[PDB]
Amino acid sequence: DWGYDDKNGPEQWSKLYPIANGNNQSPVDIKTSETKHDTSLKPISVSYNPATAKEIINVGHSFRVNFEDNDNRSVLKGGPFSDSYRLFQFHFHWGSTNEHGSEHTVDGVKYSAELHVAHWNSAKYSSLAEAASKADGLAVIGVLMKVGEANPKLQKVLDALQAIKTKGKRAPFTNFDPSTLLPSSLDFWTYPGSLTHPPLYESVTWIICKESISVSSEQLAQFRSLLSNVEGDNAVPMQHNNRPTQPLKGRTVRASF
Numbered sequence: 001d002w003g004y005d006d007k008n009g010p011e012q013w014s015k016l017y018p019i020a021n022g023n024n025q026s027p028v029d030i031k032t033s034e035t036k037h038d039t040s041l042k043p044i045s046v047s048y049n050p051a052t053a054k055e056i057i058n059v060g061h062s063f064r065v066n067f068e069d070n071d072n073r074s075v076l077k078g079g080p081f082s083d084s085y086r087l088f089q090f091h092f093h094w095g096s097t098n099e100h101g102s103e104h105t106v107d108g109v110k111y112s113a114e115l116h117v118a119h120w121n122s123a124k125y126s127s128l129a130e131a132a133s134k135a136d137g138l139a140v141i142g143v144l145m146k147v148g149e150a151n152p153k154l155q156k157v158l159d160a161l162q163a164i165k166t167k168g169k170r171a172p173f174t175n176f177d178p179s180t181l182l183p184s185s186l187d188f189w190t191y192p193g194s195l196t197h198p199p200l201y202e203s204v205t206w207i208i209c210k211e212s213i214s215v216s217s218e219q220l221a222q223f224r225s226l227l228s229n230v231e232g233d234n235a236v237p238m239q240h241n242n243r244p245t246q247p248l249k250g251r252t253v254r255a256s257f
């Protein structure tokens with residue numbers, strides 16, 4: 001289809017998805033001596049309802065926890081946005097080693113994994129589908145995940161994986177508010193950017209938390225144990241799903257702090 005291995009991986013993605021070499025692609029390296037600070041950034045506010053949590057899904061290169069997105073029970077407001085973005089899923093990226101699984105890098109420094117929390121613009125559009133391709137369509141929080149001490153807040157997700165082992169497998173994941181995964185500081189960078197895997201739409205306003213969160217080495221291993229294959233085939237562990245940082249192409253990262 002597209003994937004993360006040598007032959008279908010990130011460096012080949014422009015072949016089929018030629019936007020991969022676009023000007024607003026993601027991740028980036030945040031150079032901190034080149035961010036512009038902003039008066040106008042409001043503080044980020046997240047208000048999620050745990051009863052909108054719905055299902056954990058293994059999609060072969062990763063997994064995702066979907067939320068119910070029929071209404072503004074779980075929203076993202078503030079920061080750079082004038083209207084409310086509606087939560088629809090959270091997922092993680094990770095790498096082959098502890099030394100680099102993150103997507104965003106800060107001043108060249110790579111973290112072990114990255115949490116993406118994704119919201120769509122339900123003041124402007126009527127579906128994720130309509131919003132997903134729009135410049136103002138998507139809102140995504142990125143949390144860098146630093147290997148270190150086990151992170152207790154991962155437990156429910158980590159314990160649910162044992163039931164979505166194979167590509168396609170899915171399962172109810174309920175009563176979870178994923179604002180418990182964010183760092184306690186809400187400092188962030190924002191830049192105009194993209195989906196980090198294919199379709200690669202340039203539709204994401206990114207929110208990179210300044211502060212990292214923890215993940216232990218063994219909890220990363222749990223992510224890597226997930227299988228990219230369908231039950232009954234050869235086991236193919238999900239070693240990694242992180243995209244190299246892209247060129248800023250004249251964009252500016254704004255600091256909130």
Ligand SMILES: [Zn+2]
Nearest residue numbers: 091093116196
């Ligand atoms: Zn992602």
